[PDB]
Design a binder for this molecule. Structure first.
Ligand SMILES: [K+]
Ligand SMILES: [K+]
Ligand SMILES: [K+]
Ligand SMILES: [K+]
Ligand SMILES: [K+]
Ligand SMILES: [K+]
Ligand SMILES: [K+]
Ligand SMILES: [K+]
Ligand SMILES: [Mg+2]
Ligand SMILES: [Mg+2]
Ligand SMILES: [Mg+2]
Ligand SMILES: [Mg+2]
Ligand SMILES: [Mg+2]
Ligand SMILES: [Mg+2]
Ligand SMILES: [Mg+2]
Ligand SMILES: [Mg+2]
Ligand SMILES: [Mg+2]
Ligand SMILES: [Mg+2]
Ligand SMILES: [Mg+2]
Ligand SMILES: [Mg+2]
Ligand SMILES: [Mg+2]
Ligand SMILES: [Mg+2]
Ligand SMILES: [Mg+2]
Ligand SMILES: [Mg+2]
Ligand SMILES: [Mg+2]
Ligand SMILES: [Mg+2]
Ligand SMILES: [Mg+2]
Ligand SMILES: [Mg+2]
Ligand SMILES: [Mg+2]
Ligand SMILES: [Mg+2]
Ligand SMILES: [Mg+2]
Ligand SMILES: [Mg+2]
Ligand SMILES: [Mg+2]
Ligand SMILES: [Mg+2]
Ligand SMILES: [Mg+2]
Ligand SMILES: [Mg+2]
Ligand SMILES: [Mg+2]
Ligand SMILES: [Mg+2]
Ligand SMILES: [Mg+2]
Ligand SMILES: [Mg+2]
Ligand SMILES: [Mg+2]
Ligand SMILES: [Mg+2]
Ligand SMILES: [Mg+2]
Ligand SMILES: [Mg+2]
Ligand SMILES: [Mg+2]
Ligand SMILES: [Mg+2]
Ligand SMILES: [Mg+2]
Ligand SMILES: [Mg+2]
Ligand SMILES: [Mg+2]
Ligand SMILES: [Mg+2]
Ligand SMILES: [Mg+2]
Ligand SMILES: [Mg+2]
Ligand SMILES: [Mg+2]
Ligand SMILES: [Mg+2]
Ligand SMILES: [Mg+2]
Ligand SMILES: [Mg+2]
Ligand SMILES: [Mg+2]
Ligand SMILES: [Mg+2]
Ligand SMILES: [Mg+2]
Ligand SMILES: [Mg+2]
Ligand SMILES: [Mg+2]
Ligand SMILES: [Mg+2]
Ligand SMILES: [Mg+2]
Ligand SMILES: [Mg+2]
Ligand SMILES: [Mg+2]
Ligand SMILES: [Mg+2]
Ligand SMILES: [Mg+2]
Ligand SMILES: [Mg+2]
Ligand SMILES: [Mg+2]
Ligand SMILES: [Mg+2]
Ligand SMILES: [Mg+2]
Ligand SMILES: [Mg+2]
Lengths: 56, 61, 14, 114, 123, 118, 209
RNA sequence: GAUGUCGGCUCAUCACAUCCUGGGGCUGAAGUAGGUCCCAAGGGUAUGGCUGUUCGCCAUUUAAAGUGGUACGCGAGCUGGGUUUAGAACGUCGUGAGACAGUUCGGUCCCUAUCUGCCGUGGGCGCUGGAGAACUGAGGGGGGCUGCUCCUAGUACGAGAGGACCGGAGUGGACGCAUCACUGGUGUUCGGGUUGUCAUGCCAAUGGCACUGCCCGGUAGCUAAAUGCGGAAGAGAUAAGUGCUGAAAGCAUCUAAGCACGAAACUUGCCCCGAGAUGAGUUCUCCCUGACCCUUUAAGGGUCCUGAAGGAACGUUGAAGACGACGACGUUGAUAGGCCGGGUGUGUAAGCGCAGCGAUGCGUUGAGCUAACCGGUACUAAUGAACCGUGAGGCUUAACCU
RNA sequence: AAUUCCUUGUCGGGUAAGUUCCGACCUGCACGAAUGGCGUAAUGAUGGCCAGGCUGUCUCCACCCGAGACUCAGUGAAAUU
RNA sequence: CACAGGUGGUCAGGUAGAGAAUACCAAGGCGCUUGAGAGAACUCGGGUGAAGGAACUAGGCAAAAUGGUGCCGUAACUUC
RNA sequence: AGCGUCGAGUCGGCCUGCGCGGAAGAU
RNA sequence: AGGACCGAACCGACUAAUGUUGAAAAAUUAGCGGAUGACUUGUGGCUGGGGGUGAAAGGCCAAUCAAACCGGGAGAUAGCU
């Protein structure tokens, strides 16, 4: 099945009104390193909740 | 529908007729012609002829 | 079933 | 869990004998035929045992009048009056469904002496 | 659980040996018949000299089924074959004078007391 | 419907899952820390931790059971000599899972799974 | 009249002295505490609001805590209402036990059925599956035709199609009351009631009996 | 410059000129059983043999196996048996190529759904401060079937045969809703037997592959064939019909004034959805009681301070689930995993010892192992925080209090 | 009858029931003897009918194992208008 | 098309096997150029199934079933 | 008309205006 | 010995399913027929369009066949859209 009339840019925008992304609400700050990280995720340096969980 | 000579085609008409005598129970059916009226007339002749035979058989007893 | 040109089946009324 | 456990353990018989598949047992049941109430015996080989506490059941197979009859008794049902192990059998399976296609010398089960 | 086209063995000395169910009587769109249900049967095999002949349409009552019957306590009594007793088409009474094999208490009714009496065992 | 069911298919059949988990269990015991996807790490907890409970008691039958489940004598030897005594007092929580972001080639949630005594 | 709110424990069997095995459903009906009584003046209708169970203090919100504080009862796991019949009166804080069903012979049980999720037409509406052989092409459990060539040229409202099945309010009526255990706060009813183990059930005296 | 046909399957929907069930008039209506007409569309309204068949005949059922419309409903839902595309043969016609409203054998059925419609499920804003719950009910949908037996009663009736009305119980068929207590199915995540081959150095013991290699059982979950429940009673207004009183019209008259009945039809009563019901409803509870400055000086803007109830987000997850959504938890913690105990299933593990030439048997031993099950356990993971959400909430008119 | 319109000709067999099938009759619309007639063992991915076994073909579907469908990240069409 | 297609000759290991069939391996080569999740309807490829057993259908379509070696034994008809 | 009695109209036919029944279909 | 039998390679294509904007402008999967012969296959050569070849289907003659393809007559003709 195919369209009988060309959909408009108005309908295209209405369909895409729910396609917007959502940014991260907030970023946790480690209590030892002070680096920013996603909550419940280790930091880039390898620290999670004040402990160097992975050695580099 | 005409089962004979046209019962195969996609388009079938109610040209075939069947005349059944209610008291006696003798059945008669005609499908030769394309018109139901002509088929009814032919069946009427055959059924009346059969009834004529019934009275003849009564005499032939 | 006969396939006509342009690869379309012959399902016409005859 | 605990509630159902208490409700079921307060209805279980404590006089259930210990039997294993392949053991020939005789079960007494209350017929309740008409007004009178009598006991009928059903002796056969146990072919399947289901152990679910109150919902426990066992299947007994018997060749009666040339016809094979299998009866599934509820262990704790009041209709069952007594279970007696007439003979002990030697098997290597919990289920003995292969006895449904054997008759005569092929349906014999070795006795478990010790 | 006997539907149409189901083959059954006779449990009486009526002369037949194998019968086939052709109609499950007792209502509209009825599917299965258990122990104690009247069915319409046809005779496929029969002994050379008996009361009934091959190709006869009669009535019968099922006395044994492989599906089995269920008791109020949850017990089930399963047989190794489907068996029926031939009945007269009008009086619905047994034709033979003997019953072969055990039967169940589901037949303990005023209509089939003759079958109960003639049965060897009622389990 | 999957009411009251346990087990992740992980887009694999039974044979592939068992082989993959056996290899992953051996790698985790050998290195004491490995990086893998979060769903696989959560299923690895249910196959490696039972292998350390079996290693708390040393016997020929237990050794053969571990070899039948791991198919690596080095892993069996390490389980019944080092990991066994190390986790002898501990019960249950022999492993830890730490999420470490997402993979580069695909947006696969990754995590680190290690041993709590490391 | 009014009913009680309980929890589904499971199913078991009861053996009677004549050998009959009765499949029963265990319902845990503890004390129900009245939180608010409604009248024809302030509310326009007569009913009582009741609560049961217990809830964590750290999860009971302040508006709910204030409502329970005014009622004077301890916080429960929810709030339900029952319509008051004529000549029936209750007070705030009164506790209603399973003894209410001591003389009740048949009851109606209302619960939330187990959710099947998105279900097909065959499962949801008992549609007949088409032929599995004889040349069938990709149409085995499909619904089939859903209208007419023209007139109306549309699909009527309420057409039986695929969609959500279960997870909805279901009532079973006229269930025999096997036993009322006041000491253990239990209600045993013959048969099965909607929902899974641990779900909240509403038991009322039968209306059609 | 294309609206695909017969029949079958699946799914239906409407009409009443009603097949059954329901209510009545007449009867050449003793009863039972009928004939005819009127009202009534709530529900229900067969399986097989033959044939491509619709139809029809036959066999056996049923309360009944209704009549029609819907593109002779329905091929962007399925089929392709018939509809003679292309091949071939028979009878027949023609000299022939070929052709028969004839017969016979064989003969490719495409489309990822844009809009309307329908089945489910969400996001936004509104409902005039914000928030958390519980409801009311304008409206809408679902359901409405009936057999057999017994009692009344072998009574009424009838010469006999036969055989009731009304009323009351029980048990079935079909259908529908739930559920896994039972009986079963499944259960490639549990246990065991066994064939071929390869590997762990080798024996033993195991693992890989051969459809889960072939099998035998089976936990939980799901599920029917399994077992619980349902159709209602009652009420109001009536259809056909039946009447009371009563004139027009001294009589008569169910009607013109009045009054009483009267059906599975209608409205309720039973179940479910339901305040986007913009006519946006009701009840309970909870939270916010700073300052200053501009102005185009009013339902105005800005700055500093403040951030409440609650929500959102994240993680552990669910008998909730396509995704959202919904539910339970997040250390003051049993939410999930692991661990302990038990249960269940399988069936007497490995090692060792004895007997036997050996296969193998016996003992340790109902042993070992055991998924989703049950009761516990903080061992592991659910982090302190941060974010959104404000600071008493317009005008007019009445009624009270002040 | 690969030929028969009437025709589902009539009789018999098979089936509870057979417009198909087999055996007959001859009333051959419109068979017929090298555009061969009648039979025929064997053979046939040939047409029709029947029987045993077998089975989810079906009564009437149920569960499970995988590949898509669904969500996330990357790339990224088509008919049609 | 870095395309489930087509393309002639030569070599011919072990175990089981009549075998160049088939199952598992040796030497050798390869895991097929998007992955990660979840475990709805529906589609595709399979496994199992209570009772019945072709009642389905134009039609036993499709599935299911048989299946090797040795021995015993084997009908009408026949061009032997 | 009602049951001699009875004590004011009554009996139908015709032509005519407007009405009633005959009058059942499918989203 | 056999245009003998069963059955691999090899040669075909009888049934069903999938696909039919396909992995593929004819295939895949499961079955299926022949498989010492009128067999199959490599290389090279010959037959040319009213012609070739055809165990005969109007079949094949470069994905095109009741008269191949290319260029020309040619802007054939079109009372038709
Ligand atoms: K109706
Ligand atoms: K189960
Ligand atoms: K041992
Ligand atoms: K002829
Ligand atoms: K000849
Ligand atoms: K052939
Ligand atoms: K071959
Ligand atoms: K030419
Ligand atoms: Mg979008
Ligand atoms: Mg779980
Ligand atoms: Mg994938
Ligand atoms: Mg395998
Ligand atoms: Mg659910
Ligand atoms: Mg069907
Ligand atoms: Mg196709
Ligand atoms: Mg298919
Ligand atoms: Mg259509
Ligand atoms: Mg057009
Ligand atoms: Mg009418
Ligand atoms: Mg109506
Ligand atoms: Mg009504
Ligand atoms: Mg047949
Ligand atoms: Mg049509
Ligand atoms: Mg119609
Ligand atoms: Mg069609
Ligand atoms: Mg199609
Ligand atoms: Mg055809
Ligand atoms: Mg031709
Ligand atoms: Mg549109
Ligand atoms: Mg309705
Ligand atoms: Mg069950
Ligand atoms: Mg259970
Ligand atoms: Mg089982
Ligand atoms: Mg296993
Ligand atoms: Mg060995
Ligand atoms: Mg290997
Ligand atoms: Mg098994
Ligand atoms: Mg009067
Ligand atoms: Mg009167
Ligand atoms: Mg725990
Ligand atoms: Mg073992
Ligand atoms: Mg054990
Ligand atoms: Mg005949
Ligand atoms: Mg000729
Ligand atoms: Mg010839
Ligand atoms: Mg994407
Ligand atoms: Mg590639
Ligand atoms: Mg290639
Ligand atoms: Mg080749
Ligand atoms: Mg090979
Ligand atoms: Mg291999
Ligand atoms: Mg799947
Ligand atoms: Mg499938
Ligand atoms: Mg199979
Ligand atoms: Mg089966
Ligand atoms: Mg079976
Ligand atoms: Mg059979
Ligand atoms: Mg048939
Ligand atoms: Mg049929
Ligand atoms: Mg086949
Ligand atoms: Mg097969
Ligand atoms: Mg008129
Ligand atoms: Mg040959
Ligand atoms: Mg060829
Ligand atoms: Mg092939
Ligand atoms: Mg051959
Ligand atoms: Mg061959
Ligand atoms: Mg030709
Ligand atoms: Mg060509
Ligand atoms: Mg020419
Ligand atoms: Mg010129
Ligand atoms: Mg030109």
């Amino acid at each position: 099945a195919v369209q009988q009339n060309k959909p408009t840019r108005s309908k295209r925008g209405m369909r895409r009104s729910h396609d917007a992304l959502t940014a991260v609400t907030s970023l946790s700050v480690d209590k030892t390193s002070g680096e920013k990280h996603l909550r419940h995720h280790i930091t880039a340096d390898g620290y999670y909740r004040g402990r160097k969980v992975i050695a580099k | 529908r005409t089962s004979g000579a046209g019962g195969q085609h996609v388009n079938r008409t109610e040209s075939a007729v069947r005349i059944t005598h209610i008291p006696t129970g003798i059945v008669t059916q005609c499908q030769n012609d394309r018109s139901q009226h002509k088929n009814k007339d032919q069946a009427m002749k055959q059924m009346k002829a059969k009834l004529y035979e019934l009275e003849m058989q009564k005499k032939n007893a | 079933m006969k396939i006509l040109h342009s690869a379309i089946y012959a399902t016409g009324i005859d | 869990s605990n509630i159902i456990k208490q409700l079921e353990q307060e209805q279980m018989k404590q006089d259930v004998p210990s039997f294993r598949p392949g053991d020939t047992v005789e079960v007494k049941v209350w017929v309740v035929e008409g007004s009178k109430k009598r006991l009928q015996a059903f002796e056969g080989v146990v072919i399947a045992i289901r152990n679910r506490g109150l919902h426990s059941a066992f299947t007994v197979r018997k060749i009666s009048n040339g016809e094979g009859v299998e009866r599934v008794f509820q262990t704790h049902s009041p209709v069952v009056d007594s279970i007696s192990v007439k003979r002990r059998g030697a098997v290597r399976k919990a289920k003995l469904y292969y006895l449904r296609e054997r008759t005569g010398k092929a349906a014999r089960i070795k006795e478990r002496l010790n | 659980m006997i539907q149409e086209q189901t083959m059954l063995n006779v449990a009486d000395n009526s002369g037949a040996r194998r019968v086939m169910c052709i109609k499950v009587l007792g209502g509209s769109h009825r599917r299965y018949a258990g122990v104690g249900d009247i069915i319409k049967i046809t005779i496929k095999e029969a002994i050379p000299r008996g009361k009934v002949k091959k190709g006869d349409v009669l009535k019968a009552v099922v006395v044994r089924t492989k599906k089995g019957v269920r008791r109020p306590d949850g017990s089930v009594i399963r047989f190794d074959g489907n068996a029926c007793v031939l009945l007269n088409n009008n009086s619905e009474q047994p034709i033979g004078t003997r019953i072969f094999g055990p039967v169940t208490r589901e037949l303990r009714s005023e209509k089939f007391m003759k079958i109960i009496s003639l049965a060897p065992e009622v389990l | 419907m999957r009411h009251r069911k346990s087990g992740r298919q992980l887009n694999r059949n039974s044979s592939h899952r068992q082989a993959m988990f056996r290899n992953m269990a051996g790698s985790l015991v050998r290195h004491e820390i490995i990086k893998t996807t979060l769903p696989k790490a959560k299923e690895l907890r249910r196959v490696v931790e039972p292998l350390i409970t079996l290693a708390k008691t040393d016997s020929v039958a237990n050794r053969r059971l571990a070899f039948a489940r791991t198919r690596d004598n080095e892993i069996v030897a390490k389980l019944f000599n080092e990991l066994g005594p190390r986790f002898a007092s501990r019960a249950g929580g022999y492993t830890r899972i730490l999420k470490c972001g997402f993979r580069a080639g695909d947006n696969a949630p990754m995590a680190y799974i290690e041993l709590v005594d490391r | 009249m009014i009913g009680l709110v309980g929890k589904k424990v499971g199913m078991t069997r009861i053996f009677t002295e004549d050998g009959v095995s009765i499949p029963v459903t265990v319902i845990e009906v503890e004390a129900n505490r009245v939180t608010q009584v409604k009248d024809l003046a302030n509310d326009g209708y007569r009913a009582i609001q009741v609560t049961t169970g217990a809830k964590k203090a750290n999860r009971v919100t302040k508006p709910e805590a204030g409502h329970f504080a005014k009622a004077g009862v301890e916080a429960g796991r929810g709030l339900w209402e029952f319509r008051l019949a004529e000549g029936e009166e209750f007070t705030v804080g009164q506790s209603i036990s399973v003894e209410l069903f001591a003389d009740v012979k048949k009851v109606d049980v209302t619960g939330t059925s187990k959710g099947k999720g998105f279900a097909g037409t065959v499962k949801r509406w008992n549609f007949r599956t088409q032929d599995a052989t004889h040349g069938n092409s990709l149409s085995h459990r499909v619904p089939g035709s859903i209208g007419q060539n023209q007139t109306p040229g549309k699909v009527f409202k309420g057409k039986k199609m695929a969609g959500q099945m279960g997870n909805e309010r279901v009532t079973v009526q006229s269930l025999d009351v096997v036993r009322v255990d006041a000491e253990r706060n239990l209600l045993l009813v013959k048969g099965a009631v909607p929902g899974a183990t641990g779900s909240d059930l509403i038991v009322k005296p039968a209306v059609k009996a």
